[PDB]
Each structure stands twice: as C-alpha cells, then as structure tokens.
Design an enzyme around this catalytic site. Structure first.
Site, short mmCIF file in Angstrom:
data_model
loop_
_atom_site.label_atom_id
_atom_site.label_comp_id
_atom_site.label_asym_id
_atom_site.label_seq_id
_atom_site.Cartn_x
_atom_site.Cartn_y
_atom_site.Cartn_z
N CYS A 1 29.85 40.22 38.43
CA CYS A 1 29.81 39.49 37.39
C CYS A 1 28.83 38.21 37.67
O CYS A 1 28.83 37.74 38.69
CB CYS A 1 31.01 38.99 36.73
SG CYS A 1 32.15 40.31 36.22
N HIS B 1 34.19 33.66 32.70
CA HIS B 1 35.37 33.71 33.13
C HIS B 1 35.80 33.34 34.45
O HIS B 1 36.95 33.66 34.72
CB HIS B 1 35.86 35.37 32.56
CG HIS B 1 35.06 36.35 33.31
ND1 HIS B 1 33.80 36.87 32.76
CD2 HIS B 1 35.35 36.68 34.75
CE1 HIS B 1 33.56 37.76 33.83
NE2 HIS B 1 34.35 37.75 34.91
N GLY C 1 33.15 41.95 41.26
CA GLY C 1 32.36 40.99 41.87
C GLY C 1 30.87 40.70 41.45
O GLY C 1 30.30 39.95 41.81
NI NI Z 1 34.17 39.04 36.20
#
Ligand code: NI
Ligand code: NI
Lengths: 302, 306
Positions: A148, A41, A146
């Site tokens: 991820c 993503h 943030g």
């Molecule tokens: Ni993300």
C-alpha cells in the site's frame, strides 16, 4: 522493432518514496515538497480494517502519531508537523522539503489508459511494471501485503504525472488505489468488506493500436479489404463486451503509416473475437488491449 | 497476488547514463567509477557501418577524439585520459569518478536468465522492460535506431549486476548486445551483414515456474494425476524444441508449497504444447517461458510453515 510492455524510468519517483508508520501499521508514502501522501488506513489497527470510522480514528491522532523515514539514498527521519485527511489519503506535512522533488502533475487516468507502477515495501522500491485502468476502474497488477502506498505514474517532457496510490486488493490479481485528490478508482471503499466489481470490457482502441503494431512488426494476415463502419461496430461492441471506438489523432497516425484503415481493423476485431483458429499475432492467440495508441507510437520507427 | 513482468527499479542505472561523441557520431554510454563504456561503432562514420575495419579505425584515434557529456540529471565535466577497445566495446578512462556509482559487478547471463533493460536515446533514459536471454542467445526486446548503449542489468541484495549493452537488431523484434567484457551474446558481429540465428527453444524450467505461479494464483485446471519422469521428459524435449529440465531448489520450493510435483508439471507441458483446448492460464493461450523460478518466487512465495 519489437513490442514489449514498457514502463517509464523510475528514478525520479524512487527519490520521493518514504516509509510511514502509525502504531503497528507501516506502509509507503510519496514525499513532494514538504508533503507526504499515504493511504489513510495506516491509522487503522490491522484487526479493525473491516469497517473503520476514519473520522474518529483521525481525531485520536496527533502529529507524533506518524513517523516518516527516507530509507533509500541519504537516510533520514522526517519530522511530521501537520496532518490532514483528503479522501482515502493522509496528507502529512514534514519539516524538510524533498530536495529531489521532480517537476510533476497530479492526474486521474480514464479507463483504457496505461501507467507505470513502482511497487514498494517498507519505503523501498522493489519492482516496476505497467498496468492499464480496466473498464471497471480496477488494475491487474502484482501486489503483496505491505505494498500500500506504491505509486503509479507516467512521464512526459521531463514531468512526472502521478496518477495512482495503491490502496487494496479486491480479488485475485485485481487491485485498486486512489488518485492524489484522494478519490478511489472505481469508488471502492477502503475497508475489508466484499465489494462488487462491475463487468470488464476489451478496450477497442487499444486492440486497434496493437493490431497496427502487429502490421508494423510484419504480422498482417488478419488485414482484409473487409471494413466495418464505426457506427455499426459500436452497436456490435455494446452486445459483445467491447468498448465504443472513438477516433483519435494517434490512431490516425498509425492508419496513415500502414495504409490500413480503422474500419479494416474493426472488421479484424470481429473476426478475431470469434476465434484466431490456429493462428497467432505477435505470439498471442488472444486479443491484447493494454497497449494504448501512444504506447504503440512510442515503439515504432518515426 | 497477480503475476506481471517486473523490472528492477532503474534509478541507480539512470544516474550512470552518459553520451559519448566521436566525430559526427553520438552514442549512449555507461559511466562507472573512472570508466565510460560504449559500443565501438561510435568510431565508424554513419555511412561506413556495413563492414568496418575497427583495428584501422582505432589506430586513427587519440584520447581527444572522444567527448563524454552528461546533460541529464547531475551534470558532469569529463575529460578522456585513456582509451582501448575491448571486444565490441570502447573502454574510455575519464578523469572524474562517477559520484553516483552503485555497488556493482559485471556478469554474463546464461540462456534462460531474465534481466531488466533501460532503453536510452540521446543520453536520456526512455523506457524500462524485462527480457530473457533466448536459447539462441538473442533477446526479444523493443529497440529503435539510437538505442545502442542501452543497459541491461539485475539487482539483488544491494548489488547491481550489469549484464548487457545494446548493439543491434538481428531481425524483427530480435536483438543482441554484449556483456561488459565486450563479448557479443550469440557471437554475432557488429557489421551489417546477414547473420544466421540458431533455432530457439522453450525454456522448460521457466514454463514450470509459470505453471506453479498459475496454481498459486488459483489456476490449476491443467494439473492432473498424470506424471512424466524427468529422464523421459528430457528425451521428448530433445525432439520438440524444449530445453532439458534440471532440478533446482527454487522449483522444489514451489513444488513443496503447492503440493504439485515437478513430474505433474512436465506432463502438463506436454499436454499444453499439443494445444490448450480452448482454455487459458493467467489470461494466456500459449506457454510463457520468460519468468524464471526466482522471478516467480519474488511475486508468489510468502511465509512457509516449517
Ligand atoms: Ni494496506
Ligand atoms: Ni549505435
């Protein structure tokens, strides 16, 4: 003695964390050999995360669309020379091999397993904590915007087992991510839409391990001659949101050490689930199911 | 969202763990600059740890009595060139400066403060966990024999604060160690005698922080219009084994963000201490006092409109 939630030392993993940027999106990645793994993503603009067409987003990118920075230690911009999508991950190839790549494996943990998490923001490690994969294949962690790309792992015999890459928050205090084959734990989709989580259950084998830890820490008031056989307990568990008990060598080691049978601990679970009635076990008034048998064995005198 | 016990990443500390040997005793140690620190009981033979005469044991040693080795990570070739005893620590000077010494300082934490622990065995970092210095200057950790020399630390703004070096187990699940000035937390002696621990107390400010974390994680059933003033609460705390509440900016940030006053949280503590009435807060049925206000703000404070 003592029993605390313990994580694996993070240094070997810290040496593999990088920051990845695609347009206005930045998140964390994992750099092993000439590969950088990160959530796919990163390709999706922030205002389009509701239903992205990742195949279409991938086609619009080139190697120049991705910027990778090693932020901690010896700082360096790493040049992306190839890219591909593996499930819910991007697999970037960089021109420099990580000189601090540890001996490692990729594994997918099963519900009831514990692992350590190195929480990262902008490619900087900020915290370490331990989670358990819940019965519904979610984790109960602590992650903010943030995070991820933050990494879940275990360690044994000098080898890092990479098991999780953080992808999203499903609901309050509930998270999921993917294994390094790009498969999302719980089959959740990487999109902003509402997704149903299955019902969770108490992990019986972990509660049994915790009760053995309590006995080995001087708390044994709940141990009675009373036994409940495994078959009978399992029929009860199917109706009371507990998992099925399946015997293991690690539990047998604790049963042998303490002289308390598994069947006595299963009887204690049934009694304690009805209520602790003004009593505590290891300072708790509720059952603890996030320590595995191996986690307990690691914290008891050998 | 979520609230978990979080430790500081350990890699910078892992790069400093060594082993020190004196005779038949091998302990974990910490190598910073040209200095190696370890517990002074390395000078004591294993069968004489009950009541050693450390002044007498020290006199019998020379620099060649101590060997420092690093068999994990980046290995090193170290020679001891000086030694002295600093409280309950041995302070060795080596000929090579640790090339991976982080920016650091030494500090002594106060009761109610949290810190991370890198548990080590045989020179190998084995586990990371967070503790709080209890009111009676003990910690509730998880340590087995051979863990002495394990290191407690914090990190903030690129500085590692080294605060603890593990020494001993006082009683079940209760531990102590020294700061790097060689002073034992709680003034316990490094001898195998019975030593009384003072009574512990619940750290009020930490419980308040935890209740604010609960509100910011959608758990607010315990918040009522009921208030207890700080002066009144503190008189109650002196009789109920809670610490005195002293206001801080970090708590005021949480009060402002949630719109719940400190006095409402102090009333919630009095009610919750009498019992939770069959309800839970962040999955718990007992008060949690090991998260500091700053630890909560790390996991819950976001943007603030001004
Ligand atoms: Ni993300
Ligand atoms: Ni020792």
């Amino acid at each position: 003695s003592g029993l605390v939630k313990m994580s694996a030392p993070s240094g070997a993993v810290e040496n593999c964390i990088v920051q990845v940027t695609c347009g206005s999106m930045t998140l964390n990645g994992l750099w092993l050999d000439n590969t950088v793994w990160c959530p796919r993503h990163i390709m999706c603009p922030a205002d389009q995360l509701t239903d992205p067409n990742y195949d279409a987003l991938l086609i619009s990118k080139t190697n120049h669309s991705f910027i990778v920075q090693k932020h901690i230690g010896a700082q360096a911009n790493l040049r992306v020379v190839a890219h591909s999508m593996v499930g819910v991950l991007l697999k970037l190839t960089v021109d420099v091999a990580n000189p601090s790549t540890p001996a490692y494996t990729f594994s997918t943990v099963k519900p009831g397993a514990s692992f350590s998490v190195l929480a990262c923001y902008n490619g900087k490690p900020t915290g370490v904590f331990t989670v358990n994969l819940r019965h519904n294949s979610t984790i109960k962690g602590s992650f903010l915007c943030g995070s991820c790309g933050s990494v879940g792992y275990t360690e044994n015999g000098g080898v890092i087992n990479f098991v999780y890459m953080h992808q999203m928050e499903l609901s309050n205090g509930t998270h999921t991510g993917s294994s390094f084959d790009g498969v999302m734990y719980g089959a959740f989709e990487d999109k902003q839409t509402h997704q149903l989580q299955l019902t969770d259950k108490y992990c019986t084998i972990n509660v049994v391990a915790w009760l053995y830890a309590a006995v080995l820490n001087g708390c044994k008031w709940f141990v009675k001659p009373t036994r409940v056989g495994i078959v009978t307990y399992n029929e009860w568990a199917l109706s009371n949101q507990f998992t099925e008990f399946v015997g293991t060598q690690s539990i047998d080691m604790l049963a042998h050490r303490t002289g308390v049978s598994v069947e006595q601990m299963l009887a204690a679970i049934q009694s304690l689930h009805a209520g602790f009635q003004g009593k505590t076990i290891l300072g708790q008034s509720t059952l603890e199911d996030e320590f595995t048998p191996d986690d307990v064995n690691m914290q008891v005198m050998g």
